[PDB]
Structure formats: structure tokens, C-alpha cells
Design a protein around this ligand. Structure first.
Ligand SMILES: CC(C)COc1cnccc1-c1cnn(-c2ccc(N3CCN(C)CC3)cc2)c1
Length: 303
């Protein structure tokens, strides 16, 4: 009963990870990742609402939501490059230059999330995946609003906070891990870790440049009001080094504009006219029609 409707649209492959299954969209032949959630074993509603309203080059795209009596299925953008967490480990640590390449992509996604009125609240390398073009995609918006090693001091303490300030702190931890390959605050004991985060003191390895050190101090402030704002992160001197242009955070992936080639390709599978087809896609119901349209756009982007 749980997989009946899903099997009308997707050919299921292997379980890779909520359970995560790889699959192929029948109509287009495009690969997808399907996140499966048991309604009676559980956050799902939070992530769905957010993802329906977020659409960006650095956010893992939601294509289709299906619901049964026991399950909720979320069909998502295929990211075969795997986790940034596994990537950092495989490389030991990244140079400042490669860190900047990946960090500017994280800044792009996070700034857009804040521009839409949300805060991610769970930024960490396990939540960033590489796609086939080696571009980062931000995942898991289950804790989003309108892990302990990455949490801001105020968030752990159960104090009132601004999600944007907690995200900037988490991005500071990410920046450190990218250039060092280990956490700034770490301990086997949870209370000793909590003490280390509240104190805000960390080791500064010899390989970090003066500019990297200054940017880390600006993000890693225990006092959230002393943290750099997202707007100042966009054109920060360290961020601009070797680029000379601020981070492009605006979305290149629209809700309004439709691609004529993909509307044409999609229309052959339906008994409706052109205008009816465009009006239906524009409703963004995250049904099979939404999935088909967005997967045709990903197929076109490959060519
Ligand atoms: C299981 C976790 C990574 C969580 O995954 C997710 C969580 N929330 C949203 C999206 C995803 C998601 C999106 N794409 N993939 C993914 C796609 C393909 C592959 N392999 C890599 C190696 N290759 C040779 C075979 C295919 C691995 C992972 C997972």
C-alpha cells in the first residue's frame, strides 16, 4: 500500500541512507533521491513548507511530495558527489583557495534562505552535498524556522536567539573545519564540549593565513550581536580575495519564468493545450507535473 502511488512515477533503486532511496523518474529517465518518512515513527511538515518556498542553485530542489497512510515521500535533486563531510575527510583539509570556492557557495545559499524569511539552524558539512557538476546543495530544512559541535552558545543555553545569528556562528564552525579538517570545539564528554563552546576559545593552526584568522574571529563571537551580518559577509575582504565581486546570492531558479523548451517537452505527455499547461505548471503543487517540469529543466541544463 505504501509504495503503490510512487511506483506509477519512479523505478526504485538502492537505499543509501528518514530513509533515502535512489530512483529513476520514468517519464524523463532522470535520477532522483527519494527521502521516505514514517508518520507513526516520528519536522516533515516544516521542511516541506520551507522547500516549497525556496528555490535556488545551491539548495537541493524539492520535486514531488507524495503522502500515504503510513508514509510521506519527498522526491529531491540527485547529488552524486556525496557529502561535504566525506569530501573534507578524503582531502584531510582544503587549502584556503579551495575553501573559498566551496564557502562562497554556502554563503550564496544561506543569504538567500535569510532573504526568504527563514533560518536553516542545522548548518554542518553532512547537510551539504555535491551534485554532478561539483556544486554544493544545502539539505535538511527540518529544523528551519521563520549538531551540538555546530550550535551557537545562545542556542544550546535555551536563550532567545535570531536564527540568522545562529546560522552565521554555524558557518564559522564550517569555515574552520574546511581549512583545518577538525572541529574548533570538540570533546568526548558532552558537558566538556558545552563548556568549550560557551568559552569560545579555539586553537589557531600555523597554516591559517592572517585574513582567514580575522574572518573566523568575526563569525565566531560568543556574543551574537558582535557576529558579522550576512550582508557584510557577501563582500568581506577574505570572500572577495581572487574574485573581486560579491557573492551572488540571488536565485537563478525561478517560480515565475517558464522554459519554453521544457513546456513543449512536457506538453506531449498531456491532452491539454499550451496555455492550460503553463497555467497548471505555475500552480507548483509539487505533484508529478511539478516533478516532470523540474526534471526536464535539469535534463536541459546537462546539455
Ligand atoms: C544519504 C545522504 C547523502 C542524504 O541524502 C539526501 C538527503 N536529503 C536530500 C537529498 C539527499 C540526496 C540527494 N542525492 N543523494 C545522493 C545521490 C547519489 C549518490 N551516489 C553516490 C555514488 N554514486 C556512484 C552512486 C550514487 C549519493 C547520494 C542524496
Amino acid at each position: 500500500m505504501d509504495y503503490d502511488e510512487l511506483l506509477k512515477y519512479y523505478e526504485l533503486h538502492e537505499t543509501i541512507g528518514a530513509k533515502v532511496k535512489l530512483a529513476c523518474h520514468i517519464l524523463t529517465g532522470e535520477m532522483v533521491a527519494i527521502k521516505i518518512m514514517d508518520k507513526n515513527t516520528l519536522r516533515i511538515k516544516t521542511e516541506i513548507e520551507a522547500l516549497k518556498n525556496l528555490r535556488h542553485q545551491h539548495i537541493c530542489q524539492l520535486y514531488h511530495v507524495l503522502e500515504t497512510a503510513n508514509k510521506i515521500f519527498m522526491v529531491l535533486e540527485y547529488c552524486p558527489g556525496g557529502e561535504l563531510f566525506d569530501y573534507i575527510i578524503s582531502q584531510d583539509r582544503l587549502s584556503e583557495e579551495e575553501t573559498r570556492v566551496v564557502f562562497r557557495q554556502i554563503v550564496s545559499a544561506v543569504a538567500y534562505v535569510h532573504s526568504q524569511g527563514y533560518a536553516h539552524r542545522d548548518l554542518k558539512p553532512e547537510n551539504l552535498l555535491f551534485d554532478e557538476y561539483h556544486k554544493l546543495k544545502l539539505i535538511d530544512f527540518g529544523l528551519c524556522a521563520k549538531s551540538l559541535a555546530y550550535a551557537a552558545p545562545e542556542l544550546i543555553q535555551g536563550k532567545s536567539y535570531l536564527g540568522s545569528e545562529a546560522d552565521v556562528w554555524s558557518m564559522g564552525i564550517l569555515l574552520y573545519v574546511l581549512m583545518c579538517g577538525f572541529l574548533p570545539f570538540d570533546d568526548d564528554n558532552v558537558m566538556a564540549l558545552y563548556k568549550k563552546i560557551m568559552r569560545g576559545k579555539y586553537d589557531v593552526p600555523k597554516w591559517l593565513s592572517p585574513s582567514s584568522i580575522l574572518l573566523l574571529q568575526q563569525m565566531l563571537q560568543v556574543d551574537p550581536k558582535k557576529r558579522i551580518s550576512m550582508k557584510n559577509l557577501l563582500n568581506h575582504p577574505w570572500i572577495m580575495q581572487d574574485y573581486n565581486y560579491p557573492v551572488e546570492w540571488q536565485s537563478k531558479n525561478p517560480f515565475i519564468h517558464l522554459d519554453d523548451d521544457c513546456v513543449t517537452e512536457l506538453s506531449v505527455h498531456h491532452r491539454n493545450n499550451r496555455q492550460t499547461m503553463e497555467d497548471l505548471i505555475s500552480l507548483w503543487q509539487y505533484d508529478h507535473l511539478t516533478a516532470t517540469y523540474l526534471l526536464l529543466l535539469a535534463k536541459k541544463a546537462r546539455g
